[PDB]
Amino acid sequence: VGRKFRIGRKIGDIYHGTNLISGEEVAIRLESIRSRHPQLDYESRVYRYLSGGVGIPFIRWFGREGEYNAMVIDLLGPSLEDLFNYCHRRFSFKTVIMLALQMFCRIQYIHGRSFIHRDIKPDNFLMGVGRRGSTVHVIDFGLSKKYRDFNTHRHIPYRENKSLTGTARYASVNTHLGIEQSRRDDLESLGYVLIYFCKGSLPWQGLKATTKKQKYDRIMEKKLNVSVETLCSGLPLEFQEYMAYCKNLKFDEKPDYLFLARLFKDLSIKLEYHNDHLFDWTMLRYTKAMTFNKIKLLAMKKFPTHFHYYKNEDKHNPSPEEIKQQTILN
Ligand SMILES: NCCNS(=O)(=O)c1ccc(Cl)c2ccncc12
């Protein structure tokens, strides 16, 4: 039903859909007019302005279908959180770095297009269905705002006392303080996600509360009490360096994107990694083609170079060479 793709299995408000014209697969969402505070049309406009860039979902059609407005995107495979779960909530350093690299360029592009995503969670990073199944795409711009005016490139004025949006686990510290969000906050959230991929957990998730605000404040307290080098407890120098730079950015200040890109790329070169686009889930699926704790042990012995991990008890800054000894182990 609908115009003019047919919606099917629920993957709501997101449903699996079929292009009747071609047979192409379609991810289609419809909002619920008029409650509560629907914004789908605005998001569709954001997509339209952002189109042309890599890792940007393509809106086939947006309009009003029957009662509800509908947005239509081509299918984009699993999120990085679903792949996170598929790899037992832990990524190898090669995957994390490669994900961080593409994520950098995607987020850079958005900032180049004068916007900021302001959500940045693994749930909002989807891979793709086919040939573009190696690329990383970005979704949900419902909270996105343009930070600089388009022609004049003038930054939006400084504001405070506002609420936080939207997920506290990956939220910036400044956002908890009710500070207007700049580019720096997108990058800080990104850093939180990278640690989330390395360790598999964050110090503030899994807390106790009686109300949303009390929940946010408790996460806020934990984030303030945790040092930068403490949360990068078993991670290389570049991981601390990234978070240090991002938290020390002015509101108006634009990030030196190439510096953070080189930061992770040089770390990759130190570790003798490559942009093979061979991720953890890729090689895990391949070995499984021939619980899953067995498969993981097998895949490591097959590709000893690729799989390097984080040890949960370590309070340490593992040298590139130290980590490269996990290769000779497997
Ligand atoms: N792996 C979870 C799948 N996410 S999904 O199908 O609901 C999905 C949600 C939201 C958007 Cl914007 C999409 C875009 C393209 N493909 C799937 C999309």
Curated annotation (Swiss-Prot):
Gene transcribed to yield this protein: HRR25
Residue span, Protein kinase domain: 5-269
Record's keyword annotation contains Protein transport: no
Full-protein interval shown: 5 to 371 of 494
Subunit structure: Interacts with HRI1. Interacts with ELP1/IKI3; the interaction leads to ELP1/IKI3 phosphorylation.
GO cellular component: cellular bud neck; cellular bud tip; chromosome, centromeric region; cytoplasm; cytosol; Golgi apparatus; monopolin complex; nucleolus
Binding site for ATP: 29
Record function comment: Protein kinase which phosphorylates serine and threonine residues. Can use casein as a substrate. Phosphorylates elongator complex member ELP1/IKI3 on 'Ser-1198' and 'Ser-1202' which promotes the tRNA modification function of the complex. Associated with repair of damaged DNA and meiosis.
Residue ranges of the TM segments: none
Domain of life per record: Eukaryota
Protein name listed in UniProt: Casein kinase I homolog HRR25
